[PDB]
A paper describes a structure:
One of the simplest and best characterized TEs is the bacterial insertion sequence (IS) [name] from [name], a member of the IS200/IS605 family. It exhibits an unusual transposition mechanism using single-stranded DNA (ssDNA) intermediates and integrates specifically at 4 nt target sequences in the genome. Transposon excision and integration is catalyzed by the [name]-encoded [name] TnpA, which belongs to the HUH (histidine–hydrophobic–histidine) endonuclease superfamily and uses a single catalytic tyrosine to cleave DNA. Previous crystallographic and biochemical studies of [name] have shown that TnpA binds specifically to sub-terminal imperfect palindrome (IP) structures formed on the top strand of the left (LE) and right (RE) IS ends (named IPL and IPR, respectively). Its catalytic site is assembled in trans within a protein dimer, with the catalytic tyrosine (located on the most C-terminal helix αD) contributed by one monomer and the HUH motif by the other.
In this work, we determined the crystal structure of [name] TnpA in complex with a 29-mer LE (LE29) and a 6-mer target oligo (T6’) at 2.6 Å resolution. LE29 includes a 3 nt extension at the 3′ base of IPL (positions +42 to +44) and T6’ represents uncleaved target DNA with a cytosine base at position +1 downstream of the cleavage site. In order to trap the active pre-cleavage state of the complex, crystals with wild type TnpA were grown in the presence of Ca2+. The asymmetric unit of the TnpA/LE29/T6’ crystals contains two copies of a ternary complex, each consisting of a TnpA dimer bound to two LE and two target DNA molecules. As previously observed in the TnpA/LE26/T6 complex, A+16 and A+17 in LE29 GL form base pairs with target bases T−3 and T−4, respectively. However, in our structure these pairs also interact with T+43 and A+42 at the 3′ base of IPL, together assembling a set of two base triplets. In the fourth T6’ molecule, C+1 points towards the A+18 base in LE29 and it is stabilized by π-stacking interactions with Y7 (chain B) and F112 (chain A). In this case, C+1 occupies the position that was occupied by the catalytic Y127 in the previously described TnpA/LE26/T6 structure, and helix αD (carrying Y127, chain B) has moved closer to the active site where it is stabilized by hydrophobic contacts and hydrogen bonds involving Q132 and K125 in αD with Q59, E37 and E57 in the protein core, respectively. In this conformation, Y127 is placed in a cleavage-competent position, such that its nucleophile hydroxyl group is positioned 3.0 Å from the phosphorous atom of the scissile phosphate in C+1. The Ca2+ ion is coordinated by H64 and H66 (β4, chain A), D61 (β3, chain A), Q131 (αD, chain B), C−1/O3′ (target DNA), a water molecule and potentially the scissile phosphate (C+1/OP1, target DNA).
Residue numbers in the entry:
A (entry chain A): 6 to 132
B (entry chain B): 6 to 133
The structure:
Amino acid sequence: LYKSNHNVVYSCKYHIVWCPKYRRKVLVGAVEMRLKEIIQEVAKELRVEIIEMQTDKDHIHILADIDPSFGVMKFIKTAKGRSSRILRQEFNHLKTKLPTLWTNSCFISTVGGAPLNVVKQYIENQQ
Amino acid sequence: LYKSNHNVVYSCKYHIVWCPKYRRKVLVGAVEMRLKEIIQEVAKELRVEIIEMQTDKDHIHILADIDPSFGVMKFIKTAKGRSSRILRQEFNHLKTKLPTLWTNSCFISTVGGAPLNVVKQYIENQQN
DNA sequence: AAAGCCCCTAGCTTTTAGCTATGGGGATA
DNA sequence: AAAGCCCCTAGCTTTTAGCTATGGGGATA
DNA sequence: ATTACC
DNA sequence: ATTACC
Ligand SMILES: [Ca+2]
Ligand SMILES: [Ca+2]
Ligand SMILES: [Ca+2]
Ligand SMILES: [Ca+2]
Ligand SMILES: [Ca+2]
Ligand SMILES: [Ca+2]
Ligand SMILES: [Ca+2]
C-alpha cells in the first residue's frame, strides 16, 4: 500500500513522541481531547494521515504517514506550534508557570510494514 | 540505537530505490563501481549513514539513515544529481544515448525495528 | 547531561505566538 | 498510466548540469 | 520552573 | 526513446 505525489512513490510512516514543557502531566481531560482535535485538524489540512494517535498523561504518541518531500518536521512544527497557540488560548493553566506548552525537542522513529531485519534481506549489501 | 541533532532524537531509516532513464541496464561495470563511489562521497559529506547499498543493472537499492530535519529528499536530490553530472562526464555513452541519467522519480519506504501492526497496537493501547 | 533545564539568533506560523534549525552557547548536580 | 514516457517553470547543485517541487501540463491511440 | 517517552 | 524495483 503506497501513496505518491507528482514524482515520488512512497510509504513514509513515523512514530512521533513529544512531551509538554517540564514534562507536566497536563495531557489529560479536556486538554487531551482538544489536543487530539487540533492535531487531526492539522493533519487533514497538511495532507498527513494519522494512522494512530494517543496521549499518555505527559507525552503523546503519533503514527503518521507524511509526504517525504513535504517533510516530517514541517508537520511537527505545525502540530506543536498551532496546538500550543490554541490550547494556551483556551486553557489558562497551560500558561501558569509555563513559558511555552511544548519543548524544542521530540522523538521520531521510522516505521514500515516489514521490520528492519526483513527489509535488510531485500538488499544484498555491497557496502 | 538512536542518533540526535540539536533538538531531535531520531531513527529515520529509508529503503530508497531509483532506476536509470528508460530503465536501461546501464548500472554495470565501471558505471556501477563509480556510481557507488559517488554516493558514498555524498553520504559522508551530508552526514547520511548508508546501512546497505546494492546496484542491479537497472535499479539501485539504498537503505540509509537520514536526519529527519535534513530531509530524505535532499539526500536523494544530491545523490542522483551529482552522480548524473559526473558519470555523464566520464562515460560518453551515458551522455549521448540518454537525455538524463535518471528519471524524476524514486521509491521511498520507511522502516524501523518493529512492524507497522505492532506499533499501531502499541500506540492504541497506551491509556491501558 | 540533554531532547528534555537556562540562554541566544532567525525563519515561519500560531505572529501583543511559539514552534523549528542535519541551528548555537552554557551550569546544574 | 504514471513514478517511470514527453513538455514546462523555478530552486539549488552538479551550474555551456541535472536533479527537485506535499510542482504542473499532456499523449500513448 | 525538567528528568523521561521509544 | 520506458514498463518496473521482495
Ligand atoms: Ca509530472
Ligand atoms: Ca507511553
Ligand atoms: Ca542484506
Ligand atoms: Ca534484488
Ligand atoms: Ca539547543
Ligand atoms: Ca538523559
Ligand atoms: Ca504501472
